[PDB]
UniProtKB/Swiss-Prot annotation, chain D:
Parent sequence residues shown: 226 to 301 of 301
Function field: Necessary for efficient RNA polymerase II transcription elongation past template-encoded arresting sites. The arresting sites in DNA have the property of trapping a certain fraction of elongating RNA polymerases that pass through, resulting in locked ternary complexes. Cleavage of the nascent transcript by S-II allows the resumption of elongation from the new 3'-terminus.
Family stated for the protein in its record: Belongs to the TFS-II family.
Additional detail: S-II binds to RNA-polymerase II in the absence of transcription.
Entry protein name: Transcription elongation factor A protein 1
Main location: nucleus
Disorder: A chromosomal aberration involving TCEA1 may be a cause of salivary gland pleiomorphic adenomas (PA) [181030]. Pleiomorphic adenomas are the most common benign epithelial tumors of the salivary gland. Translocation t(3;8)(p21;q12) with PLAG1.
Naturally occurring in which organism (per UniProt): Homo sapiens
Subunit (UniProt): Interacts with EAF2. Associates with UBR5 and forms a transcription regulatory complex made of CDK9, Pol II, UBR5 and TCEA1/TFIIS. Part of TBP-based Pol II pre-initiation complex (PIC), in which Pol II core assembles with general transcription factors and other specific initiation factors including GTF2E1, GTF2E2, GTF2F1, GTF2F2, TCEA1, ERCC2, ERCC3, GTF2H2, GTF2H3, GTF2H4, GTF2H5, GTF2A1, GTF2A2, GTF2B and TBP; this large multi-subunit PIC complex mediates DNA unwinding and targets Pol II core to the transcription start site where the first phosphodiester bond forms.
Curated annotation (Swiss-Prot), chain H:
Function: Component of the PAF1 complex (PAF1C) which has multiple functions during transcription by RNA polymerase II and is implicated in regulation of development and maintenance of embryonic stem cell pluripotency. PAF1C associates with RNA polymerase II through interaction with POLR2A CTD non-phosphorylated and 'Ser-2'- and 'Ser-5'-phosphorylated forms and is involved in transcriptional elongation, acting both independently and synergistically with TCEA1 and in cooperation with the DSIF complex and HTATSF1. PAF1C is required for transcription of Hox and Wnt target genes.
Name of the protein in its database record: RNA polymerase-associated protein CTR9 homolog
Protein's cellular compartments: Nucleus speckle
Organism: Homo sapiens
Expression (tissue specificity): Widely expressed.
Highest taxon in the source lineage: Eukaryota
Self-association and partners: Component of the PAF1 complex, which consists of CDC73, PAF1, LEO1, CTR9, RTF1 and SKIC8. The PAF1 complex interacts with PHF5A. Interacts with KMT2A/MLL1. Interacts with STAT3. Interacts with SETD5. Interacts with ERCC6.
Length: 78, 209, 49, 67, 270, 99, 248, 40
């Protein structure tokens, strides 16, 4: 019964990319094959293109309720 | 003046009829947009100590769905109306089961009268309108949008839909001329419809408080 | 880049030119016309860039 | 006013006409031309002013500028 | 904006302007001289006006002709107003509209020397012969642009903008102006924010403020997206009353003590 | 070297016109324009005459330029400048209004 | 004089901007697709009364606003009697279908009636006849791009039945949603918000104009619908955007 | 053509509805003018 938009806003995309890059920088397992690159931020961007980020976004509503939206479920803007 | 006074009385009567029709009270299509010729032919067109004197042109109108609910429209002659006049009006009003009314005062009521008006509010609702404010109908102005008084059921439905508390809706004080025109009181939401240049139509809501 | 399509007017574009003949062929090289991302007519200025 | 003499009536009429004229406001100046088509009324009558050339519609009154 | 046939012809618009413009004695009076004429029939001055009509003093308040004709007044209404305003205590002997000099004669019937001075001063400063207060003078300019021309859908379909006379005052009354006849009570705005809130309503104030903002921001040819203007207008008309953007309107909202101190009045709000 | 002749002729015509307006105002012929006093309408007429003269001079200067001119190229490009700048540089500066 | 004006402006505009920024600092678009402030007080049910970002909006024109009654009839009616015009515009396998079948005629009449209703609405909302309006998707540019890509060559009879256009426009009017919810109030708000854009879409996409000035084919029209829906979806206002600071 | 005819008679029904409202409003006015009279 989720009513928020099915598209990923730019703010959420930026924050997810940053958090995932920070996690890879701290020696975390990747969810995608590396083609010969090392920078964590590009790794996160490739990951977002591949829709394999193990993060789910909790959009809080003004009333107080919330909805858990998964990166691999909603459509990516860029 | 004689002719100007008649014109002012006719305009006030037209505005009162339009207000009653807007609120929901059933009125003739004839008297709703009656010209001034039949006004002259009806009363006598001699307001200066003649037939068309105040308190005789008063009208009582009942609501559409509730024929048992009416409202008087008085016209006291005293320029600085006191407490005795409103007292006798209320005393004569008590015979009938009517509760609402509307007072048309020449000039601003004395502050001592407003206390008595608000005192009898829970038992007999009555408000005032200066004649200078009734010479024009604001709801027809270009800036003023089309207001719709809502019912409690749809207000609750609205509040439940957006999951938003009625306290969070915008505010509008009862002193607003539109608010007194429609007779809305505290704790009541009014629909607003403005022509939106970027979205065609945009409907917002405002709670009186 | 790409296949862009847009129409703009030049700064020194005489107004009395669209109404009369030579609308699609301007003697003064005005009436910027771009099709498939290729400049065809007109002189580029601030109105277009 | 009606009972006044012919000379007095003529003087009063002239004074009233002069006052009515003087109460007016001077029209905005400009070069009127029909070479510009107003988009708000579809008419050709209008007035221009060079300063950028401001366009003022004559009948419709469409206001625009050309750089 | 004129409503009746006066919108087309200026002859029936000049009277509308005159009635909407404040006219006092000072605007129509030219000279005012007091005389201690003992016997009313004596008439120290040579004027053949008193004995036909019939206190040891009178005021000879002669009026100008050009101004009186410009505002289109008559001595009858002037005498009626000057007699009713001060009660049945004086006796103004007006003059016929045939003589060259528009002389008058104000006498009192029932310390007394300065009473005439005081009454002449307080009537000359303000008497409101024909018009309303606040409004000082009114202009008459035809609309040259579409922002003020009348628009009516023609039977053929085209809009066909019409050129009609419109007024431009210098004060703020609105309320007493809309009640006047031959005045469109639908398109006559006020150009003021606080005034409309006591006449039309908060929504009308929002619309007028939006229009004024758009007018003042688009005067230099610049363009601002309407969404920002609407967002400002709603924020300034959210609590019913016109909250001021200054420290006296935003700190009154129940936002929070930590937000109020940031803008201004730190120690006070804390 | 012909545009200079046209500009000088236009300036002389404007001077003659403003002198004639001053003479009419002195001898009490210029009637007050509606909505304004005598001094106000006199000043408005003088300003309108001067602005018309300046616009005529600027138009004459612009129409006398060559395609190889750099001021005109840079103005029509809109990169930096305007027609009024060319008018002030060549034809005539104009009125120095204050307040 | 100019220098003094510049100095006093540089002194005053800063204070003006500071007061403007400090009054609408906490206003934002929550995930409920509504504009509120720090006190959770709703200021606008939809951002900008429509719920669209200010970046993806362009100036456009309303073709059905300020015609003449005669010209409006001969530009948006799609006369189905002159078979010669239909043969010139549509192909032979469509003229017989649009003539014999009466359901198509009734549908086209209903479309024209809706177009007239939209024109009356536009006239009663936009007085003074202002064709210049701002809308998300520039439909003329999209049509031009479709023509230039699919090589429409507007001289040959196109293969695009009017019923295809009608059903596509109806489905697109359903797909573009702002106020989600089947609730009657929700549907009413959705219709009110996305009103001008739908009117413009109907005015540009007709049975007559598509077969006389655009000549788009079925594939071209489908690509056009897809592009329009994608661009409108991208034009939606992103929740969590600080619109108060942007306006200030 | 038949659909046009039925629409026209539906408008006629709406007009008769106006007639009944006018008669009802007059039939209550005949009673209300009495109150308007005794009020003064």
């Amino acid at each position: 019964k989720r009513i928020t938009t099915p598209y990923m806003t730019k703010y959420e995309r930026a924050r997810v990319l940053g958090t995932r890059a920070l996690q890879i920088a701290m020696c975390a397992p990747v969810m995608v094959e590396l083609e010969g690159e090392t920078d964590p931020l590009l790794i996160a961007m490739k990951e977002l293109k591949a829709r394999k980020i193990p993060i789910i976004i909790r959009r809080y509503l003004p009333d107080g309720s919330y909805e858990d939206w998964g990166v691999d479920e909603l459509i990516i803007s860029d | 003046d004689d002719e100007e006074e008649t014109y002012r009385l006719w305009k006030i009567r037209k505005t009162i009829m339009q207000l009653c029709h807007d609120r929901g009270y059933l009125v003739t299509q004839d008297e709703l947009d009656q010209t001034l010729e039949e006004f002259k032919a009806q009363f006598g067109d001699k307001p200066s100590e003649g037939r068309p004197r105040r308190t005789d042109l008063t009208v009582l109108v009942a609501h559409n769905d509730d024929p048992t609910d009416q409202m008087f429209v008085f016209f006291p002659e005293e320029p600085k109306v006191g407490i005795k006049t409103i007292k006798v009006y209320c005393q004569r009003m008590q015979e009938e089961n009517i509760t609402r009314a509307l007072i048309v005062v020449q000039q601003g009521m004395t502050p001592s009268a407003k206390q008595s008006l608000v005192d009898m509010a829970p038992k007999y609702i009555l408000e005032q309108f200066l004649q200078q404010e009734l010479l024009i109908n604001i709801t027809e102005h270009e800036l003023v949008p089309e207001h719709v008084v809502m019912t409690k059921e749809e207000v609750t439905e609205l509040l439940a839909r957006y999951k938003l508390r009625e306290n969070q809706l915008p505010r509008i004080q009862a002193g607003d001329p539109v608010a007194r025109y429609f007779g809305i009181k505290r704790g009541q939401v009014v629909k607003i419809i403005r022509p939106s240049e970027t979205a065609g139509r945009y409907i917002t809501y405002r709670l009186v408080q | 880049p790409g296949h862009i399509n847009c129409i703009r007017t030049h700064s020194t574009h005489p107004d009395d030119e669209d109404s009369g003949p030579y609308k699609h062929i301007s003697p003064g090289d005005t009436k910027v016309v771009v099709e498939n991302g290729e400049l065809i007519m007109g002189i580029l200025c601030k109105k277009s860039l | 006013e009606e009972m006044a003499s012919d000379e007095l009536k003529e003087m009063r009429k002239n004074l009233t006409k002069e006052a009515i004229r003087e109460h007016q406001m001077a029209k905005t100046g400009g070069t009127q031309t029909d070479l510009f088509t107003c988009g708000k009324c579809k008419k050709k009558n209008c007035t221009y002013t060079q300063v950028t050339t401001f366009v003022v519609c004559n009948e419709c009154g469409n206001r625009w500028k050309f750089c | 904006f004129l409503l009746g046939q006066s919108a087309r012809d200026a002859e029936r618009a000049k009277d509308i302007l005159c009635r909407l413009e404040h006219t006092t004695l000072r605007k129509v009076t030219a000279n005012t001289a007091i005389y201690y004429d003992p016997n009313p029939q004596s008439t120290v001055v040579a004027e053949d006006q008193e004995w036909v009509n019939v206190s040891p003093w009178l005021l000879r308040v002669e009026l100008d002709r050009k101004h009186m004709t410009d505002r289109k007044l008559t001595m009858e209404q002037i005498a009626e107003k000057i007699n009713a305003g001060f009660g049945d205590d004086l006796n103004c002997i007006f003059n016929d509209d045939n003589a060259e000099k528009l002389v008058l004669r104000i006498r009192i019937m029932n310390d007394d020397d300065v009473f005439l001075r005081c009454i002449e001063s307080n009537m000359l400063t303000d008497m409101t012969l024909q018009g309303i207060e606040q409004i000082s003078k009114v202009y008459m300019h035809l609309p040259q642009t579409d922002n003020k021309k009348k628009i009516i859908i023609t039977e053929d379909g085209e809009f066909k903008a019409l050129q009609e006379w419109i007024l431009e005052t210098d004060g703020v009354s609105l309320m007493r102006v809309l009640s006047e006849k031959d005045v469109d009570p639908v398109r006559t705005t006020s150009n003021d924010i606080v005034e409309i809130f006591t006449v039309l309503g908060i929504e009308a104030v929002r619309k007028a403020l939006e229009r004024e903002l758009y007018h003042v921001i688009s005067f230099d040819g610049s363009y601002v997206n309407y969404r920002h203007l609407a967002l400002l207008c709603d924020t300034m008309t959210c609590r019913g009353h016109l909250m001021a953007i200054t420290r006296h309107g935003v700190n009154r909202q129940d936002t929070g003590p930590l937000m109020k101190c940031s803008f201004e009045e730190t120690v006070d709000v804390l | 070297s012909k545009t200079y002749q046209d500009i000088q002729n236009t300036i002389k015509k404007a001077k003659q016109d403003v002198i004639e307006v001053i003479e009419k105002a002195h001898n009490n012929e210029l009637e007050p324009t509606p909505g304004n006093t005598l001094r106000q309408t006199f000043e408005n007429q003088v300003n309108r005459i001067l602005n018309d003269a300046r616009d005529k001079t600027g138009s004459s200067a612009q129409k006398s330029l060559s395609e190889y001119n750099n001021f005109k190229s840079m103005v029509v490009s809109g990169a930096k400048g305007s027609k009024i700048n060319i008018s002030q540089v060549i034809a005539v500066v104009g009125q120095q209004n204050v307040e | 004089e100019g220098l003094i004006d510049t100095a006093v402006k540089t002194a005053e505009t800063g204070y003006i901007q500071r007061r403007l920024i400090k009054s609408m600092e906490s206003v934002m678009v929550k995930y409920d697709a509504t504009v509120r402030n720090s006190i959770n007080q709703v200021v606008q049910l939809r951002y900008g009364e429509d719920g669209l970002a200010g970046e993806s909006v362009e100036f456009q024109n309303l073709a059905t606003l300020k015609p003449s009654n005669k010209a409006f009839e001969k530009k948006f009616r799609f006369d189905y009697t002159n078979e010669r015009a239909l043969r010139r515009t549509l192909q032979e396998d469509l003229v017989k279908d649009v003539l014999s079948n009466a359901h198509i005629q009734n549908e086209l009449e209903r479309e024209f009636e809706r177009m007239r209703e939209d024109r009356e609405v536009l006239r009663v909302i936009f007085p003074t006849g202002d064709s210049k309006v701002v809308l998300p998707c520039n439909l003329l540019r999209m049509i031009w791009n479709a023509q230039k890509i699919f090589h429409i060559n507007p001289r040959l009879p196109s293969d695009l039945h009017p019923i295809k256009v009608v059903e596509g426009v109806k489905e697109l009017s359903k797909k573009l949603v702002i106020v989600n919810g089947d609730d009657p109030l929700s549907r009413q708000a959705q219709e009110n918000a996305t009103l001008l854009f739908n009117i413009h879409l109907r005015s540009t996409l007709c049975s007559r104009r598509m077969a006389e000035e655009f000549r788009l084919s079925g594939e071209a029209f489908d690509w056009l619908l897809g592009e329009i829906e994608s661009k409108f979806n991208q034009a939606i206002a992103h929740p969590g955007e600080m619109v108060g600071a942007l306006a200030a | 053509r038949q659909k046009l005819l039925k629409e026209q008679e539906e408008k006629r029904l709406r007009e008769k509805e106006e007639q009944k409202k006018l008669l009802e409003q007059r039939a209550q006015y005949v009673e209300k003018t009495k109150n308007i009279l005794m009020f003064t």
